[PDB]
């Protein structure tokens, strides 16, 4: 109920280092693909944790 949002802006995002931080199976993406997160690039990232 009190989930935390982290605001990510003005940096270089490397998504291949996320796999070394947690032992998860699926990087379940919806609008995009997990293998194409480095070629295209975004505006703002928000990370919700619970």
């Amino acid at each position: 109920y009190a989930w935390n949002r982290k605001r990510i802006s003005n940096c270089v995002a490397d998504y291949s280092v996320i796999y070394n931080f947690a032992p998860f199976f699926a990087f379940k993406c919806y609008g995009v693909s997990p293998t194409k997160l480095n070629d295209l690039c975004f505006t703002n990232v928000y990370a919700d944790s619970f």
Binding site: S16, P23, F25, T35
Partner: protein, 49 residues
């Protein structure tokens, strides 16, 4: 034998680390992929090198 993170990379039309530099499948691939856990055999307390 891979790490459990890169099981999704053994598929046609994939990029990453295994699919880019280690083991690449063709785009017109016809076949099957079988992957199973081997924690009992390939894991050691000192570290399997």
């Amino acid at each position: 034998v891979i790490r459990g993170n890169e099981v999704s990379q053994i598929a046609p039309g994939q990029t990453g680390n295994i699919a880019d530099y280690n083991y690449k499948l063709p785009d017109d691939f016809t076949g099957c992929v079988i992957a199973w856990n081997s924690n009992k055999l390939d894991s050691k307390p000192s570290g399997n090198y």
